[PDB]
Ligand binder design. Structure first.
Ligand SMILES: Cc1ccc(-c2cc3c(N[C@@H](Cc4ccccc4)C(=O)NP(=O)(O)O)ncnc3s2)cc1
Ligand SMILES: Cc1ccc(-c2cc3c(N[C@@H](Cc4ccccc4)C(=O)NP(=O)(O)O)ncnc3s2)cc1
Ligand SMILES: Cc1ccc(-c2cc3c(N[C@@H](Cc4ccccc4)C(=O)NP(=O)(O)O)ncnc3s2)cc1
Ligand SMILES: Cc1ccc(-c2cc3c(N[C@@H](Cc4ccccc4)C(=O)NP(=O)(O)O)ncnc3s2)cc1
Lengths: 339, 339
């Protein structure tokens, strides 16, 4: 499904840019900057979210209604998801004071960008809507897509606010509850990473019903919870030469699924070991946390969670996939649940 | 027109907030933060942009079609303009490293906000669209308003990019040309400050024609150019006990209308006096610029510009106001051109 169309998708970017950078010579300079912004930040991910739109649109539309223009539009809206992602990242890395991203210098950290990245992020967001105007204003789902991107923006922003309130990078754990962890993930990542791209395909295919969308959302948000929990696990236990990432959740005082669990289980004594070491950057003090999680057999708790999670998803799919082809959902679960 | 409805408008804010902060207990914390963001940043301006929507809607709709619900919606969309303004300011003050705004500490500069303001700004933007959903999704102009706010966002962002490229707060004047000054003002401030609110009233009143809108835009953008040029003049020559502002365009290396003119007129010698002193914060070095502008009789050049500008506007109004009541436009020119 995905490896099979990643070429046409990543190749269409050029067009996405050509159009977004074309009557008005006076502003050409700013447009030059926009090009640069898009080239640095929309590129270099694995493109799974955007791609999900394309793949799903193939699965959902009767192939008789998949002309060149229709596909073009699915590529375009797929790139709209990747631009939403890019907008959030650029802005999130400023906020976290991150150094790298996708293995390069964060955009804001480049010489002579700095906090100008704030506006660059805002343009990334704007390009979504330009693109929808240009490719979709005549389509019957035009407004549905706008509302979905705008709503996907809002929930992510809310989730971000929620995380910022939860984890002031300053030492506190009583606010790291499972209720709250789950909330953060739903609003901050799941909605836009899992629901938004399938939903966009759905609208593109004429499937606009609230019921259908509620059903698909129910599956997708639970998939999204898992995805993140696995991300949290692998931040620390992922072989880094598989992953590509080397993890810093413990140094960055994150509200990781791990710590949440660790806190549910710890003696009042061990809370101390964690109160003392979480957030510090001393390797010794980072080791004494990993080593605590390990003492609490949390890698086992994960495996245990991944199994249940895998059933729940299949159950959800059995129950709510209809009348969409289960393959829409399985195509994603495949990308997540390795054996 | 304006003093006459500023009460109902500023009073409606409470409702705007009540609604934007109301099913979902898990996120209530973030909503609390949102409330705070809106209270600090949507409040304390003079509300001229928002108000323009309300006043214009009164002028444009047959009074038989101005029920309670219609008004409610004009207040709401007026507040949407003020939220757009708030979103841009919060983000612009981070970018400039400003200290104050509307006579208080900039939001980002408050203890324990910082660059979290980036997300706070993004929520300000989001609230626009929530508000439009809640009050206007059933109206026939719903999509027109979304497109207008989104487009107003994009042009402002472009203008911001353009300004950032023009004025790196690092010393340069060859890029401060009149063509470029004019471009910056059109994209960065005029469009959203002058065109957007009248346009929103227009759409609200059933007047959606491209022609009408082109006409209104033509008047409004030229009004907007003046407004800004006057702002630039008064930044330096405004009696500060009238204004409320004390100006720092020269210290901040801005691409002010003043400097632009100064550069058009200066001997190759005087370019030097300006190359040496513009952007410095030394009062002596700030004085030696003001004193140069004064030596070049620029306060006279302004008066000269304000006169011509005043004719051009009236001409534009005579020519393009129809079939809107000229009073829509005069109501604004009144707020700008004191004798
Ligand atoms: C800890 C743990 C326990 C069980 C699993 C299971 C994964 C899995 C599974 N995973 C697929 C991925 C998958 C998932 C869902 C639908 C389709 C495909 C897989 O790993 N295929 P591969 O050829 O690479 O070994 N497919 C069918 N049953 C199961 S049970 C994964 C992790
Ligand atoms: C909607 C959506 C968003 C992100 C993803 C990502 C999947 C993924 C990823 N998944 C692996 C699978 C995987 C399984 C277990 C642990 C890590 C990685 C994968 O794509 N395998 P495939 O053989 O299909 O190319 N690996 C590294 N980064 C990412 S980011 C998937 C779906
Ligand atoms: C430098 C300079 C030269 C001429 C003017 C003019 C302002 C003006 C003008 N201004 C109105 C404001 C105005 C503008 C446009 C339409 C209506 C009202 C005004 O100042 N009224 P006020 O009672 O406070 O003295 N009205 C009619 N003709 C003119 S000519 C302003 C500044
Ligand atoms: C669309 C729009 C946006 C901002 C304005 C502003 C007008 C204004 C403003 N205008 C003065 C007039 C003015 C004239 C000349 C110099 C300064 C101020 C005014 O409102 N007079 P009014 O008697 O109607 O209350 N003074 C201080 N700040 C601002 S911000 C007007 C219209």
């Amino acid at each position: 499904v995905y490896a099979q169309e990643k070429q046409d998708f990543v190749q269409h970017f050029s067009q996405i840019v050509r159009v977004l950078t074309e009557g008005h010579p006076e502003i050409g300079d700013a447009i030059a900057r926009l090009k640069e912004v898009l080239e640095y930040n929309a590129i270099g991910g694995k493109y799974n979210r955007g791609l999900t739109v394309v793949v799903a649109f193939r699965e959902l539309v009767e192939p008789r209604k998949q002309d060149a223009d229709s596909l073009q539009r699915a590529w375009t809206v797929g790139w709209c998801v990747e631009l939403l992602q890019a907008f959030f990242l650029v802005a999130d890395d400023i906020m976290d004071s991150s150094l790298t991203r996708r293995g390069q210098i964060c955009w804001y950290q480049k010489p002579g960008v700095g906090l100008d990245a704030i506006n660059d992020a805002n343009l990334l967001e704007a390009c979504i809507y330009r693109l929808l105007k240009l490719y979709c204003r005549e389509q019957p789902y035009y407004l549905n897509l706008i509302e979905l991107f705008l709503q996907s923006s809002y929930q992510t922003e809310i989730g971000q606010t929620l995380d910022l309130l939860t984890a002031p990078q300053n030492v506190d754990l009583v606010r790291f509850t499972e209720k709250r962890y789950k909330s953060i993930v739903k609003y901050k990542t799941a909605f836009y990473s899992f629901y938004l791209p399938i939903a966009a395909a759905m609208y593109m295919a004429g499937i606009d019903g609230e019921k259908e969308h509620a059903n698909a959302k129910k599956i997708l948000l639970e998939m999204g919870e898992f995805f993140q929990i696995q991300d949290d696990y692998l931040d620390l236990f992922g072989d880094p030469s598989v992953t590509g990432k080397i993890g810093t959740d413990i140094q960055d005082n994150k509200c990781s699924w791990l710590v949440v669990q660790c806190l549910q289980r710890a003696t009042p004594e061990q809370y101390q070991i964690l109160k003392e070491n979480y957030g510090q950057k001393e390797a010794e003090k980072v080791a004494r946390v990993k080593a605590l999680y390990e003492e609490l057999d949390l890698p086992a708790v994960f495996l245990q969670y991944e199994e249940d999670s895998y059933s729940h998803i299949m159950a959800l799919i059995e129950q709510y996939a209809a009348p969409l082809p289960p393959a829409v959902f399985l195509g994603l679960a495949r990308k997540i649940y390795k054996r």
